[PDB]
Design a protein around this ligand. Structure first.
Ligand SMILES: NC(=O)c1cccc(N)c1
Ligand SMILES: NC(=O)c1cccc(N)c1
Length: 339
């Protein structure tokens, strides 16, 4: 409908204005108190912080510039920040501030105290189809938005989907997101979620996100992903094979949708055909979904996470609290000039 076309045209206009003139250097480290480590990785960490003047809590992603360089993530980190400062959609975590110092890059996000979908899914076992469908619809709309801006997300997995106070999704971690007209080539993403064309080193496009949605829906509804195995090489063999087995409890509609998302031929995969996202939105598995009501957050959620307030970290796990230091000397200044 012209309504969707005009919505997306305005979304692109607003994205492009911020994309062309990114914000920079909008806070500094000593504006915040450090509260707790919420997550770690090979080149950074995410910390719960509190702004010392307003009292607001945020999730601060801290990336070590030297480790970003070593692990060949320079362009990826520049992508992440430039994209996040430019997007605006109900199911994307908002970047509130960014800055850098001699040692680190900082992305200060809205804090989502409900934690990762991953934890809730593993705790409950599997989600009912209505519950999985509620989350899936949010991802469908989010990908419609991102792909219309020529953005590919490239890291869909339960760990990157936080549950907010209303029970809705907030997608976090844009470390692999990229603005791509046409194809791109980088091997990235988590093994169980990789499309065949990534595994086979092809030039790939937004169809990889629709493949990953199939994996996510399967994992939400089954409790385990479709191509599981013990080593990555065995996972990859299963992914490229064209074979998937479905639990008997899956509905026929769910199986049909999944065969079309988990289509190994990218030219036949739902989301990548002439009808685009509408092949997904109009599929019978989504017949009960009111797309506008989801976008407007008017649907009652399946599940409201339990938490005590905006400083509650109970839905995140415990990590060694390590020092974060800032060198007296600037590191990697040239590489990160635009950040
Ligand atoms: N935005 C958040 O609350 C958050 C928390 C932990 C990890 C990430 N990536 C984000
Ligand atoms: N140095 C640190 O680990 C840190 C993290 C967050 C806030 C502040 N002020 C310091």
């Amino acid at each position: 409908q012209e309504s969707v076309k005009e919505f997306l045209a305005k979304a692109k206009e607003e994205f492009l204005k911020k994309w062309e003139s990114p914000s920079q250097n909008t806070a500094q480290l000593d504006h915040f108190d450090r509260i707790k480590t919420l997550g770690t990785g090979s080149f950074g960490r995410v910390m719960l912080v509190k702004h010392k003047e307003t009292g607001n809590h945020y999730a601060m992603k801290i990336l070590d510039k030297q480790k970003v360089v070593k692990l060949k993530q320079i362009e990826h980190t520049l992508n992440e920040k430039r994209i996040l400062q430019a997007v605006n959609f109900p199911f994307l975590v908002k970047l509130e501030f960014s800055f850098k110092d001699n040692s680190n890059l900082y992305m200060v996000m809205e804090y989502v105290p409900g934690g990762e979908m991953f934890s809730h899914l593993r705790r409950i076992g599997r989600f009912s189809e209505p519950h999985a469908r509620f989350y899936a619809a949010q991802i469908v709309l989010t990908f419609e938005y991102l792909h219309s801006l020529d953005l590919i997300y490239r890291d869909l997995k339960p760990e990157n989907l936080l549950i907010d106070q209303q029970g809705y999704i907030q997608v976090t971690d844009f470390g692999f997101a990229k603005r791509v007209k046409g194809r791109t080539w980088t091997l990235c993403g988590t093994p169980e979620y990789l499309a065949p064309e990534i595994i086979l080193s092809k030039g790939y496009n937004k169809a990889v996100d629709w493949w990953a949605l199939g994996v996510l829906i399967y994992e939400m509804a089954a409790g385990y992903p479709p191509f599981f195995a013990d080593q990555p090489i065995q996972i990859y063999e299963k992914i490229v094979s064209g074979k998937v087995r479905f639990p008997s409890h899956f509905s026929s509609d769910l199986k049909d949708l999944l065969r079309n998302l988990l289509q190994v031929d990218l030219t036949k995969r739902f989301g990548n055909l002439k009808n685009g996202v509408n092949d997904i939105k109009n599929h019978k598995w989504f017949a009960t979904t009111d797309w506008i009501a989801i976008y407007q957050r008017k649907v009652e959620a399946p599940f409201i996470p339990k938490f005590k307030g905006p400083g509650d970290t109970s839905n995140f796990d415990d990590y060694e609290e390590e020092e974060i230091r800032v060198s007296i000397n600037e590191k990697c200044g040239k590489e990160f000039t635009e950040f």
